[PDB]
Amino acid sequence: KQLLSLKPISASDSLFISCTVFNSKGNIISMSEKFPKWSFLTEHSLFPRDLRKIDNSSIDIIPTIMCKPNCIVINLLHIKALIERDKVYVFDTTNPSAAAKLSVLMYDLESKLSSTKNNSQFYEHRALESIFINVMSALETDFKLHSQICIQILNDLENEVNRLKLRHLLIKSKDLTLFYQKTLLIRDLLDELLENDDDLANMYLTVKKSPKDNFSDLEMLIETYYTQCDEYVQQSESLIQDIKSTEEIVNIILDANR
Numbered sequence: 001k002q003l004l005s006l007k008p009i010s011a012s013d014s015l016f017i018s019c020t021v022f023n024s025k026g027n028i029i030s031m032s033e034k035f036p037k038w039s040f041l042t043e044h045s046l047f048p049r050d051l052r053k054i055d056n057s058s059i060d061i062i063p064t065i066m067c068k069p070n071c072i073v074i075n076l077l078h079i080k081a082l083i084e085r086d087k088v089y090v091f092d093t094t095n096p097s098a099a100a101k102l103s104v105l106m107y108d109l110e111s112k113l114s115s116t117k118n119n120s121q122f123y124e125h126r127a128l129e130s131i132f133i134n135v136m137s138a139l140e141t142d143f144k145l146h147s148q149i150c151i152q153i154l155n156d157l158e159n160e161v162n163r164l165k166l167r168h169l170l171i172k173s174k175d176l177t178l179f180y181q182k183t184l185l186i187r188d189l190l191d192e193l194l195e196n197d198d199d200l201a202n203m204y205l206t207v208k209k210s211p212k213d214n215f216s217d218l219e220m221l222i223e224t225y226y227t228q229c230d231e232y233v234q235q236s237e238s239l240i241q242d243i244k245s246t247e248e249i250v251n252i253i254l255d256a257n258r
Contacts, residue, residue, distance in 0.1 A: 017054055017091060020106055024086035026114030026123070028106065032092065044071060044082060054080055058095035063185045065193055067202035072124060076135045076186060078102060083127045085205035088113065105134045124205045125218060132225040139183055143232050146176045147239055154246055161253055173243045180236040187233045190226040194219065 009015075016034040023029045041050060045068060053064065053075055061080075066073035072083040078098035080091040090106065093099050109130040112118065118126060153169040156162070193199055197211035203218060 017056070019054075019092055020090045022088040022090075022110065022113060022127075024123070026110060026112075026126070028110050044073075045069075046073070054082065054089075054091050056092050056094045058093055058098055063182075063189050065189060065199075067193075067199040069202065070205065072128065072203060072205070074128075074131060076131065077138050077182070079105065079131055079135065081127075081131060083124050083205075085122075085124055088127045101134070101138060105130070108134060121217075122204065122206045124203070125221065128203070129221055132221075135186070136225055136228050139179075139186075139229065139232055142179050143183075143236065146172065146179055147235065150176055150239055150243065154242060157246060157250065161250055166247070166250055169243060170247070173240065176236055176240060176243075180233065180240060183229060183232050183236065187226070187229045190222060190229060194222055194226060 013034070015037060017037045017040060018032050018034050020028060021030045021033055037051065037055070038048065041048065041054070046053065052061065053066075053073055058078070061075050063077075064073065064075045070084060074081045074083065078093065078095070078101045080093075082089040082091075088109070090102065090109070093102065109127065112130045113123065113126050115126075121129070149172050150169065153165055153172060157165050157169065197215075200215050200218060201209040201211045201213065204215075209215070
């Protein structure tokens with residue numbers, strides 16, 4: 001209601017969120033653009049507790065796809081974004097690794113969103129698909145990294161039991177487990193979305209859809225990325241089980257030689 005002295009802060013930039021903005025043509029029209037944060041939340045029908053869904057924090061970010069009347073709010077891995085029928089906001093981060101990945105997203109998103117060859121797909125779904133593709137590329141890279149090292153160590157151990165190899169395996173398994181957990185959350189989120197016709201219908205921002213309308217094209221789109229995500233869940237789960245099995249087998253062998 002009224003103005004009062006503010007709580008002390010290290011930098012007044014903390015009153016703003018910053019982002020990259022894409023126009024209705026799909027072109028980037030600003031980078032590092034600042035918006036007053038509480039006002040921005042209110043304007044986009046978000047509550048103060050939703051600040052983390054658009055701010056520069058990168059810890060404890062739960063995956064989300066909020067299908068609001070006039071926008072889709074997305075948090076997936078390094079990406080926080082707000083998609084409208086004729087604009088996209090991609091939010092800044094303090095995480096260097098995330099910032100590097102976001103730079104590639106910007107390029108690919110601008111390409112796909114602004115394309116004059118793709119006039120069959122709604123703007124908001126071009127943005128959605130660009131984001132899904134960028135998310136899956138990040139998962140692909142991590143999955144290949146951690147699974148390949150674990151498979152190598154497992155093969156090494158099957159050839160000859162070795163305590164140093166075993167320690168290495170279980171250390172590397174931590175990474176695989178973290179990968180499984182974050183991917184599982186995304187898989188379950190996409191599953192929920194596919195099962196909710198109200199959310200699906202809401203995802204059409206350019207044309208108005210009823211829950212009873214045909215969403216085949218949007219469903220095919222989401223299914224594509226659901227399947228890729230789900231396969232990473234299945235593969236990482238199976239590999240983790242293989243590691244647990246191997247730990248148990250090695251344990252028995254170690255006991256038998258005591």
